[PDB]
Design an enzyme around this catalytic site. Structure first.
Site, short mmCIF file in Angstrom:
data_model
loop_
_atom_site.label_atom_id
_atom_site.label_comp_id
_atom_site.label_asym_id
_atom_site.label_seq_id
_atom_site.Cartn_x
_atom_site.Cartn_y
_atom_site.Cartn_z
N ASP A 198 1.07 -0.95 0.34
CA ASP A 198 0.14 0.10 -0.20
C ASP A 198 0.52 0.92 -0.21
O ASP A 198 1.88 1.36 1.32
CB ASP A 198 -1.04 -0.23 1.27
CG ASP A 198 -1.78 0.61 0.63
OD1 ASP A 198 -2.46 1.92 0.70
OD2 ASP A 198 -3.07 -0.20 0.58
N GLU A 255 -1.08 -0.87 -4.94
CA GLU A 255 -1.56 -0.42 -5.26
C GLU A 255 -0.69 0.86 -5.65
O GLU A 255 -0.51 1.94 -5.10
CB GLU A 255 -2.50 0.13 -3.65
CG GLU A 255 -3.08 1.80 -3.68
CD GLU A 255 -3.63 1.87 -2.58
OE1 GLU A 255 -2.45 2.69 -2.05
OE2 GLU A 255 -4.41 2.30 -1.59
#
Ligand SMILES: [Ca+2]
Length: 536
Positions: A198, A255
């Site tokens: 992330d 991501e």
């Protein structure tokens, strides 16, 4: 070699809203263990659960204060080891959100540097300044400056790209790079099968001495200085290669929210030894909480660009809704028929489906009154504008409840017992639940959304829809339609996006997933309906 994730099908859980098993109104890991039977029946082969590390909960647990234990509300390390044992016994994998850009102010490392200005943990974060001055004008995504003068407090300031309490890691310093690797390896040894890396795009940040020339002189959200830098790839490369070496069946899924499609290549290309797949946010399209209208042609251009540009390299990720956005019904579906049609539309393409928990039941945003529930600032001042507009109190709340992230974390409605058997106490969030769906009602009823996803997912497993090439058919601007082919075999997915019934010119033709249509050679679809047609 081929790896488990090549034929992956992912079910995302926000575990606070999945199943409560100790009557605190907050979902836990033992709850999820109770509902492994349900997951197998749906047919998902992998669970991605949201962050569950010990954390202040300042930003849904992405502000991590300890990667090596497990938030008290969710359960114990014993519970998590058992969940990953139970899931593996059901032939189901698990992957976790692991954030590479920051920790919370509470993390031991930051607590050392905030309290000892002469600490070696000051290099683990990003510090600079003279006399509580910000050394440059870079602005955070959460508002004001990225700088925060340190409490220690020497008249320097530490970097946070998001909230003031989530300080950024210095990836220049190789002591962090090993440390983050050690966190990943720790969890991989537990036996978790992959990881959602992330905010990884932000580990790279420019020369701190530079400013961004702007509107002036308010600090400015300067993406070029702290997103997608060449440093990102060189620092991720050994991080990824080491994970792969030691755990080669491990999914590394990125991501790259609103990254270039050329960047999605850079991050996923086998040559660069980085990521397997990437989630992108580029698929989709008073001010700011007005119900969303999807620019439908724009969706078609991006869906095709992505399937095309990634055809030779990497699987695209296939998803509709999320924990950070309004559910499928509500945001974009207009009917149970369209909800089905859309799932078909997206997931039977080439890629890996990521379907949000409760999407399969056809859930909607919860809908409720009172700003507090939202855990958000802008809701109060936004409702004032519509009220001035003279939109009812009722209607104003609705509009915001139908657009905001938080109403999309409704507890799973499982049954007809109190709180739909999700808990026994006050559920951590609750409101209207407009309108009432339960798994009991949909597992029996073969007309239901659930049964459609179930059948849809068993079709997706087929060699045609897992490994076949994709080619989008010439366009009804009305309708989304495409073809999947192994070369040997071939099929056509066709989905109406019109509320009026419409007609399709195509060859010839066997059906499997579908909800009311005509059979001649030319094809007519009931309003918002769709069908999968295997050729000859
Ligand atoms: Ca609980």
């Amino acid at each position: 070699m081929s790896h488990w994730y090549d034929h992956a099908i992912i079910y995302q859980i926000y575990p606070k809203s999945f199943q409560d098993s100790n009557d605190d109104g907050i979902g836990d890991l033992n709850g999820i263990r109770k509902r492994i039977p349900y997951l197998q029946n749906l047919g998902v082969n992998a669970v991605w659960l949201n962050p569950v590390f010990v954390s202040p909960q300042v930003d849904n647990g992405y502000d991590v204060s300890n990667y090596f234990a497990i938030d008290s509300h969710m359960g114990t390390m014993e519970d998590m080891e058992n969940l990953i044992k139970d899931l593996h016994k059901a032939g189901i994998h698990i992957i976790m959100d692991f954030v590479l850009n920051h920790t919370s102010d509470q993390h031991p490392w930051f607590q050392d540097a905030i309290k000892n200005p002469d600490s070696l943990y000051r290099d683990y974060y990003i510090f600079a300044g003279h006399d509580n001055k910000q050394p440059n004008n870079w602005g955070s995504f959460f508002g004001g400056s990225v700088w925060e003068p340190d409490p220690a407090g020497t008249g320097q300031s530490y970097f946070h790209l998001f909230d003031k309490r989530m300080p950024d890691l210095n990836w220049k310093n190789p002591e962090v790079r090993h440390a983050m690797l050690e966190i990943a390896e720790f969890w991989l040894k537990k036996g978790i099968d992959g990881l959602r890396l992330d905010a990884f795009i932000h580990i790279g940040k420019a020369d701190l001495r530079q400013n961004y020339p702007a509107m002036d002189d308010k600090p400015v959200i300067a993406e070029p200085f702290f997103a997608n830098l060449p440093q990102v790839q060189e620092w991720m490369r050994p991080f990824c290669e080491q994970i792969k070496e030691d755990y080669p069946d491990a999914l590394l899924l990125g991501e790259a929210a609103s990254a270039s499609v050329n960047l999605a290549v850079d991050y996923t290309n086998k040559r660069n030894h980085l990521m397997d797949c990437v989630i992108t946010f580029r698929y989709f399209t008073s001010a700011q909480y007005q119900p969303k209208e999807l620019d439908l042609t724009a969706f078609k251009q991006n869906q095709v660009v992505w399937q095309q540009t990634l055809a030779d390299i990497s699987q695209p990720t296939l998803y509709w809704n999320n924990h950070d956005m309004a559910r499928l019904a509500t945001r974009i579906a207009k009917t149970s028929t369209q909800a089905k049609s859309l799932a078909m539309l997206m997931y039977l393409q080439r890629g890996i489906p990521i379907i949000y928990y409760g999407e399969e039941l056809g859930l909607k945003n919860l809908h409720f009154t009172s700003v507090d529930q939202f855990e958000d600032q802008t809701v109060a001042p936004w409702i004032k504008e519509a009220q001035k507009a003279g939109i009812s109190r009722d209607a104003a709340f609705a509009m915001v409840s139908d657009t905001h992230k938080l109403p999309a974390r409704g507890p799973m409605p499982w049954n007809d017992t109190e709180n739909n058997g999700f808990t026994s106490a006050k559920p951590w969030l609750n409101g209207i639940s407009q309108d009432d769906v339960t798994v009991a009602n949909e597992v029996n009823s073969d007309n239901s959304m659930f049964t459609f996803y179930k059948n849809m997912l068993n079709l997706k497993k087929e060699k045609l829809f897992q490994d076949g090439t994709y080619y989008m058919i010439s366009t009804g601007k009305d309708s989304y339609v495409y073809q999947r082919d192994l070369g040997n075999e071939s099929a056509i997915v066709a989905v109406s996006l019109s509320n009026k019934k419409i007609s399709i010119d195509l060859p010839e033709e066997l059906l499997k997933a579908g909800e009311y249509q005509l059979t001649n050679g030319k094809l007519t679809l009931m309003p918002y309906a769709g069908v999968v047609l295997k050729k000859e």
